[PDB]
Amino acid sequence: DPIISRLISREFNHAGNRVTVEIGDHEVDVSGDFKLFIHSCDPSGDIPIFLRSRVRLVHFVTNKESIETRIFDITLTEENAEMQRKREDLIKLNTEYKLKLKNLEKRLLEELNNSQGNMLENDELMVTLNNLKKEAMNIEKKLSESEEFFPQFDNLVEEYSIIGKHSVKIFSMLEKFGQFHWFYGISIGQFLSCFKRVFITRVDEILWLLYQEVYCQFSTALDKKFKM
């Protein structure tokens, strides 16, 4: 409805202490601890141009585009498990060691001010700072191997793109049967679980493995016409 309207555009009438907003008729006081979110379920439903312009539109939608992204993660786990293992920790320990570098700098300054009049305790943190000579240079060790890992990651996106582009066209096709008939539904997870079974010219053979496994699992939930 229109009335929220002044609450969507940031309009207010300010007072000495009170902040008032006009809603339909009554002028009501705004807190400031108050937050607003608007939630919608169907993308088909169209929102007013007033709102769409003042509103930050964010799509939490598990699209067909999401399938291309998610088949590469499954492919790489079964194609180069050594580099998919190191992918997660590469950006994890990038941020974690830098947060621990900031956590140890704070520990050093706390004890340097407390144990300046006390015995040479700082030394007990300096052997932890001796351990930091692995940590500071661990980052250097990881940054060096990153410049080696990233261009290899980008080399592996291409093959999976070749796999990826066919799989969406296949999901599109199976999705479209559900549009004709109610019983002909497919989830993204059903296609993923099917593509996992595909493992347990290499790119060309895996492609042929996909088409076969999809024909194998999803042919069953269709009638003779839709099979053909």
Side-chain angles (χ1 to χ4, degrees):
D1 50 312
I3 51 191
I4 311 321
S5 180
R6 291 261 278 262
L7 185 55
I8 284 135
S9 46
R10 287 318 192 182
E11 283 173 278
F12 305 99
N13 294 263
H14 296 86
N17 191 285
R18 68 177 268 173
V19 180
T20 186
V21 74
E22 199 172 73
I23 289 169
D25 291 78
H26 212 256
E27 299 248 308
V28 280
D29 294 286
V30 188
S31 175
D33 269 37
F34 168 88
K35 291 277 168 292
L36 188 69
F37 294 83
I38 317 151
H39 174 82
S40 174
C41 316
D42 58 289
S44 321
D46 194 38
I47 41 165
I49 176 146
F50 172 80
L51 183 62
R52 203 142 80 262
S53 309
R54 332 272 185 276
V55 171
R56 212 178 259 102
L57 194 57
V58 183
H59 291 357
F60 292 101
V61 65
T62 52
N63 289 305
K64 300 187 284 132
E65 286 72 55
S66 181
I67 284 187
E68 206 172 329
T69 308
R70 216 199 280 191
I71 67 106
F72 173 84
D73 287 50
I74 284 142
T75 315
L76 228 75
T77 315
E78 278 84 273
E79 184 276 309
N80 242 289
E82 60 175 71
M83 63 197 288
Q84 187 60 264
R85 140 77 66 160
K86 76 176 167 183
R87 200 225 164 188
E88 298 261 291
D89 59 66
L90 199 103
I91 304 134
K92 169 82 186 77
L93 293 158
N94 158 257
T95 50
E96 184 68 69
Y97 267 108
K98 277 166 185 262
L99 282 155
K100 287 290 275 182
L101 193 104
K102 282 268 188 284
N103 193 277
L104 282 177
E105 287 248 335
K106 279 187 147 171
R107 269 269 216 89
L108 190 270
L109 259 81
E110 290 257 77
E111 209 162 66
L112 295 172
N113 284 259
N114 269 54
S115 67
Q116 51 184 59
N118 203 251
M119 72 197 310
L120 309 152
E121 180 94 54
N122 307 308
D123 202 281
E124 296 212 60
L125 174 65
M126 216 142 287
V127 294
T128 317
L129 299 173
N130 206 314
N131 189 78
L132 181 69
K133 298 265 182 285
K134 284 198 164 181
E135 296 175 312
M137 287 166 171
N138 225 53
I139 298 159
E140 196 268 291
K141 188 220 265 186
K142 283 175 201 295
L143 214 113
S144 60
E145 68 189 303
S146 289
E147 220 273 293
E148 292 150 24
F149 171 69
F150 283 103
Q152 280 199 294
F153 204 85
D154 290 297
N155 193 84
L156 263 58
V157 278
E158 294 165 4
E159 289 209 334
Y160 308 3
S161 295
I162 297 166
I163 298 167
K165 291 182 180 183
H166 284 111
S167 61
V168 291
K169 285 186 207 138
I170 288 151
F171 193 84
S172 178
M173 183 212 66
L174 294 153
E175 207 172 58
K176 253 173 269 146
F177 299 149
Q179 283 172 12
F180 191 117
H181 195 272
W182 52 274
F183 189 80
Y184 299 175
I186 192 161
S187 77
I188 47 105
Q190 273 151 37
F191 205 94
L192 298 172
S193 296
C194 170
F195 180 73
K196 287 179 187 164
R197 298 183 77 251
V198 175
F199 303 105
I200 313 103
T201 194
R202 173 54 178 169
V203 72
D204 295 83
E205 223 174 34
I206 190 65
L207 186 73
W208 197 69
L209 253 285
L210 200 157
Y211 276 73
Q212 278 199 303
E213 272 286 296
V214 162
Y215 193 77
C216 202
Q217 304 287 88
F218 306 120
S219 192
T220 64
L222 271 60
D223 84 316
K224 289 181 179 181
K225 191 209 192 192
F226 278 70
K227 280 174 193 139
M228 271 168 180

